[model samples]
Target: STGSATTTPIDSLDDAYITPVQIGTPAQTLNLDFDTGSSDLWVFSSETTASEVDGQTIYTPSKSTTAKLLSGATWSISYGDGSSSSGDVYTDTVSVGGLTVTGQAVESAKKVSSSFTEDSTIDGLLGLAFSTLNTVSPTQQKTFFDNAKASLDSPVFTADLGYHAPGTYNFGFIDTTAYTGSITYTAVSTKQGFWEWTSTGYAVGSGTFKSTSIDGIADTGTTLLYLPATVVSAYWAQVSGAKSSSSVGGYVFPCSATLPSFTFGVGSARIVIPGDYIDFGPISTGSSSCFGGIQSSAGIGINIFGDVALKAAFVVFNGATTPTLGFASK
Candidate 1:
């Protein structure tokens, strides 16, 4: 059937988004980051080192009657930010919103990087990307979305992320009221196991639209919007004291500088990100220099339309035979 869940930003800067998920027979609830960039539904659990548990809620398979250890199966994942986790596998009943999957593979962490351990806001990650990207040795497991797709009213899911407010994630169908205007659909390339699509063009503030194709992936896990150097430079140039600092590791501007809005096109539809959203936050506590929400993706190789960009629009992940992505203004 259909299911809907509320997702909230973990911090004022909207560093990440977390959704409550239920695992196991009796339903052990844990706040998990719903990541569309990667595929591995992993969690901190009883198997995790006690010291690494911090304040995160853990899943104890021993307490669930339906939990079954996937013998000899183990998994390890390393993120672009250098955070990593390794664990064993267990098949258990997992539910998100109201959709339940009886045989969902839940990776139980044995060890996690300091970043994950320190951030108690999220216990783990629930991947919404292609199941082929799942990281499991011997037998790669399917993602929660993949496992539940067959029974869904429609093979689709939508992401509605908010700037400083709460948003929603809907499965099986789109909530027509969540957005305004018609959705612009674009072909998706899942060859790299990511929701990769080409943006039609971009523009700085109220400037004329530049019609150029820009390839990028929609990554809910990432915090910033990373675009080609040319586009990034154009945006920063509009700010009075903006500079690409070597020490800061990215573009930053004077805290009081007036930032220009950024607009990107998907098919013929253009989505505008307010200037306020581009002024991410200060580089450090009480610092006058603020880090930018949009940065150059030159070294990263691929452009990433992360939270900074996604939060500005309503996005739909169409999981049909030939997948597509739909974007609309709210």
Candidate 2:
């Protein structure tokens, strides 16, 4: 069996991508962020405090005959961006695209951080990472992908993220027409419960590839590309007016700076991120300085190939007995 869904950027900056999901007996459609960095299928719901709810859609399990409270089960999670949510759990019929999973754990938020409350574009998050990362206590719950893996034509899902456009997320089978070349497969370490892999190296612009090993995770939940300070500095040095500003919290440069493209290696294949993609946007409304899409991962402890990097290539999250990741140019 296979399923396909379209994911779109919530705004012009492509801050995050969201997709529609169906939950309950009479499907309650909600736009959710399909995050590969965490494992918790949480949503804004009727259980949430009214004061915390803004214009976001709320899932009401009480309205669905298929929804059952998971007696005593509760969950809580905090993201890298500091947004958090916690609530009780329910098992219900949940569907994505055309694929359906029965008795899926749906965490209904009782409380959400201010950031989540302000973002009306997304109702919740659909975790695609390994179930080992699930935060539910007593007994951990499986992710939608993990629960559906057994019946899928193939235990795999692919992310085709686009720049300033909508992309498709496919489950069960790869779309041959989505990419342009042969996919380069790389080993993934699931010990960390993330799609973690070692990158071969990175190059600034048309420069020669630097043959070095850089370990990082492919995180769709994050917004920017974060690498070692050395690599980030090397790239920014090439820009005429780039500087690391403590006040700005990251490297910023003139809005009109001629930014260089960034290329990272997945095995022997090199995926290039265009120069324009690196110029995230003006630091503030109508400001002359622009924030960079790439930043230092110094305090982050690990590199993150977030949306800024993912949007440059077609990525495959293969959840077979031996998980592996695949990358290809589009």
Candidate 3:
């Protein structure tokens, strides 16, 4: 991670909603995506079916004095990995570490079957990603940010994975003091409302790839540096030991063997995705396969620069202040 004076705060799509609810004391809390679009934060529960859920972060409302349920409401969430969990509506006094909100709504996912067991860390995800489809009564609802706007420390909240377990998930202000001062904030491309950007080019090994034409937008939702066809082909040609692991998508190689300094756009941020990440792969716990940073969705519409890329730079998503990703100075 870049030190102070150079910071890049990656943008986030809070459209998905997950709320952390501690049944009893604030000590037993969790982070959730307060999502209205998709329902269910099926934390791992003993009562949960062995097949429907992913990981286990069971919310024992019995531990708290303030716990309620929304009867008649059903919820289910299917992840990209084809894993899913379903449950009913539940309500509790959910807290975000330092900040606590009243009437914090939660879901009791009873059908999670352990599809996300490998993700022992994530109890569940709050789906706030943009969606054109709807199943709930209200077309759109403010799950987290809209509700916590007044109580948060900053208008924005950031997930600083750089911190300890259940680390510094800030409420209001996003502290990018850990990064450089330069950020090449890209304009908002309205194709699908995803946080996207145009790549100036790509780099692998010691070569510089300058695009003759524009490519797809760089996204934070995506977890890997998905390159264009021609760009990827050219990059791998020089990247020693880089080979294809899957028939679809680009190539998957040994991070320890072939990873090199990569750069995109005008900012000369030649990033070397650590071998730990490049070597990351699908985390399977007998029942499911949890993908590491690089996923096989290249042909998909998005050429995302997911959280893995943000680790190399300071990424700030300022919808209110700048409305773009301010590439932190390095």
Candidate 4:
């Protein structure tokens, strides 16, 4: 029960970090996106239409001796990006790294959106959010961490997401060696089934911190940092040649523009996101226009400390009292 899983970042898509999980008897392996924003261990299964399966790996529950239908159980989930999936349910043995949970609910996809089908490398998503967010109907399903917590050394998980580098998702225990300095923790409010917390404020470049009291989620599934429209406008304004481009659908700037680091406050501790990381990437080949990784959360409402922001520091999702979020610079 006390073990950790080290997931290497995908070579090309640094946006999503994946881990290995084994489902059913005899072990059918799948590379899953370990998403903290939602709780549902759903997979592309045999029930999915052949045309929709494409290059993604399919999980065949019928072939597994231990797989059992939950009968009448179903799940449908829609992500913030409009990607969605709906499926039947099954009970099977699920294992991540060396931690195993028996009779875990595993959703088998009967239908999926184009986003899921197009991401051929992602077999499924291993949700790390609170179990209450699980999409399974009638009876709610627990996340891998929740089911495996009792036996773990500590009910905690560490997400060491790297920037275009290999990162490790440690379960049960935290590796002190993975981070530098002391880990500063902030109490998280999870009423919305998210790791929501308030930051003191943020500053563009080396500007003074403002007490904006921003409420946001630490979402590993999302690729960019989303903040208030005013905050985004302020940050972009500091960059020369930066503008909110209607055609590109976001703030764009010159790729060569000298960018400033962004700092977020948690009590007195500050987590500074490097300037280069905020540049994201160029709009197109031969185009000097680049997209800003930090965008306006006007429609999203909640700010998301996505991969672009999280990769700048080491984050600990503590399942202990109050569900604290511990952060430390790497």
Candidate 5:
């Protein structure tokens, strides 16, 4: 599947402030996206003007049915990509799905503004990447998994990510039936908020840069793969057959050239980006040509392999049990 088919705004009402979970039980009510694409868990806060919230869902304190807030700490976060939002922090008894647990610190953003704010179907985003990337304040704070592992029957959190299709995103339980082989697992480096690695260039057509690699955090939080300049140049090198286009946004590549295939390997795993993602816009000879994933963010630190890469594998982040992240199959 190129992407999951879940309808937009997957109506979720348990939108109250939840607590960060820990080992042995789901202590918090935090609903999040296990994002390996970005290293931060951001929320929309009350500080955002109501105009910015016109298209997005706002987590309100009074309407929240599952949990309530205690602390009055309010906040707003801005990303390196220019995306920004604001929200508040409140201590609440959180419950996930049907299980309700108490006393967890939750970050609930009341407003947001970005390219995604208009996606009526895709409401709020939950950063399910890592604990370190969590936006919660304080010198010491726990995350959703910090409490969930304790109550887990197997002490393991499995992600049955149905990549490229309308699938389920679950936590605290493993779906054994989803896999045909023993799920492969890998340990994560604890240096940053997301799992980052070296790339062997992006193969487009027959041209490949064997010595080139992209180094950025792998994040599920971001919808697009944000590549640094050098990596973007590397992609262009292979696609010399195509024409380049520009936009106020990221990239949109379009060409009828002999499109090339690209793949990246991490440890024992290999991920391939489909040709559709490689070929960019307005398909004919005289239309607006576009570059697919590369965007112009000069000062941005590193490359980010966002949801584009995540769709290629089943990822499980083991933050509650250890500082390391674990990657496996769906």
Candidate 6:
């Protein structure tokens, strides 16, 4: 039988899912943000400067009898948000969901950006992107899924991200019962180590579905759905009092503004994002203004189907011969 693990997505102060993992000999548990946008399994560690370590729990590899340093090896990575981390490497036992991987190359962070240091709940990052994106110097490291895929029934995982509710990340096998209806599969191009796919078209509110091609990546680490600036402007134009706020960032509107449902076309499926979900709650402490969950990705060039889009459907990330992304309404 293939091994499979169910990781419960914990709510974060920001917009990411924290997967539970155990590392080292005695099993030091840590809540790591499972990021598909980048590669590297890095955690806050004793090697980090004391000043940089705030409320986060650190992993002390020296305490683990099974930990061994990878001599001369190091790693560093930066996120699109500008958050970065760098440190040395160590080989140790790493376990998640019921699968135990021996001699896993885990990077221990010695330095991290202020964005990460301030986000105490995000202990580290477990990269789910293709291993080619790994940052380990001299020799790249394989992701948890890469190392466990051989032992899985099928090289596939499913992301069932929920809205304002707990979701589950299933590895190695797709749970047929997790989603309803038929799964609409789409071809994915992984030239960039990301689950990149194209949407045939999109529609705002109840308007006509335009036949425009949109290249996008299915990113779990990103909090919002990002579209082209022109597309974002058109969507928000339907809402009264909605404007781009340079001060607040992204598009903001009155809390009472009426929102329309946004739809994306996949093969033959039309996945709709409800208007209620468009309002990403309050932007700051005790404010009536809320940020639009769908933002502009104009500067980035590629659209991102982040948590806001993933939560709208049950997604299957198939890593078989030809990688494909399957979607079905939850």
Worst 10 residues of 3 by lDDT: 1-10
lDDT of 5 by residue, 1-330 (tens): 011112111222111112222211323222334444433333333434666655444444444454455455555556655766656665555444444335555556566665546543333444445556555454323454455556654444433333333344445555666555454454555566566555544544455435454566656555445666655566666654443444334444544544455555554554565555444454344675544644434456767666555545555545544534344444
Give model 6's TM-score versus the native structure: 0.95
Better of 3 and 6 by TM-score: 6
What are the runs in model 6 whose C-alpha is more than 4 Å off? 1-14
For model 4, how does the per-residue alpha-carbon lDDT over 165-256 read when each residue is reduced to its tens digit?
A: 77888888889999999898998988999988888889989898887788899999898899999899989989998999889988999988
Taking all chains together, the TM-score of candidate 4 against the true structure is: 0.96
Candidate RMSDs in Å, in order, are 0.7, 0.7, 7.0, 1.4, 6.8, 1.6
Q: After superposition, how far is residue 219 of candidate 3 from its true place, in Å?
A: 6.9
State model 4's lDDT: 0.88
Off by over 4 Å in 1: none
lDDT of 3 by residue, 1-330 (tens): 111111122223111223454433434555443332232333554446666445446666666567665556666666443666666655565455545556544556676545355554456554332333212223222344445666555554443332111223445566766465545556644345444555555565556556553344434333455555666566555546555546433465543453455555534433444434443443323322222344434555556665455445545544443334445533
lDDT of 2: 0.95
What lDDT score belongs to each candidate, Candidate 1 first?
0.95, 0.95, 0.46, 0.88, 0.47, 0.86
Error of 1 at 181 (Å): 0.5
Cα lDDT of model 5 overall?
A: 0.47
Candidate 2 wrongly placed segments (more than 4 Å): none
Backbone clashes (count) for model 6: 0
Q: Per-residue CA lDDT of candidate 2, range 1-330, in tens?
A: 888999999999999999999999899999999999999999999999999999999999999999999999999999987889999999999899999999999999999999999999999999999999999887899999999999899999999998999998999999999999899999999999999999999999988889999999999989999999999999999899999999999999999888899999999999999998888889999999999999999988889999999999999999999999999999
TM-scores for candidates 1 onward, in order: 0.99, 0.99, 0.69, 0.96, 0.69, 0.95
